[PDB]
Amino acid sequence: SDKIIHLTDDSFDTDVLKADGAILVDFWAEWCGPCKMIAPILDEIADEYQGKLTVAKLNIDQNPGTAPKYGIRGIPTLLLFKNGEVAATKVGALSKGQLKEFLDANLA
């Protein structure tokens, strides 16, 4: 895909909690049409912000355990982990512009 980490509950700790940078964890599901629809945007963003931001796409169907942990009651969820610190959590799709702005504002 791109600079998109297909995380698992098991890898979550080492990858996200110990993120050597900023990791945007997108919580998605096989049935999540909208998640797929934003995937190109996430890919583009992941490329654009390479070195500043890293992106991940965690499948809750495969990893149910991770959903409760971050109160994933709706997807696509976008949780921005700055070195494991959840800086911001967005729920639902948004425009590339909004996403870029959000990311810029959080990264600062």
Curated annotation (Swiss-Prot):
Q: Tell me the superkingdom of the source.
A: Bacteria
Give the disulfide map: 32-35
Q: Which residues form the active site?
A: 32, 35
- List cellular component terms (GO): cytoplasm; cytosol
Site location (Deprotonates C-terminal active site Cys): 26
The alphabetized list of GO BP terms reads:
cell redox homeostasis
Citing just one GO molecular function, the answer is: protein-disulfide reductase activity
Q: Any idea what this protein is called?
A: Thioredoxin 1
Per the record, residues carrying N6-acetyllysine are 69
> Cross-referenced CDD domains, in alphabetical order?
TRX_family
Which species is listed as the source?
Escherichia coli (strain K12)
Q: Which family does it belong to?
A: Belongs to the thioredoxin family.
What UniProt keywords apply to this chain's record, in alphabetical order? Answer: Acetylation, Disulfide bond, Electron transport, Host-virus interaction, Redox-active center, Transport
According to UniProt, residues marked as the site described as Contributes to redox potential value are 33-34
| Pfam families according to UniProt | Thioredoxin (PF00085)
Q: How does it assemble?
A: Monomer. Interacts with bacteriophage T3 DNA polymerase.
Thioredoxin domain: which residues?
Answer: 1-108
Q: What does this protein do?
A: Participates in various redox reactions through the reversible oxidation of its active center dithiol to a disulfide and catalyzes dithiol-disulfide exchange reactions.
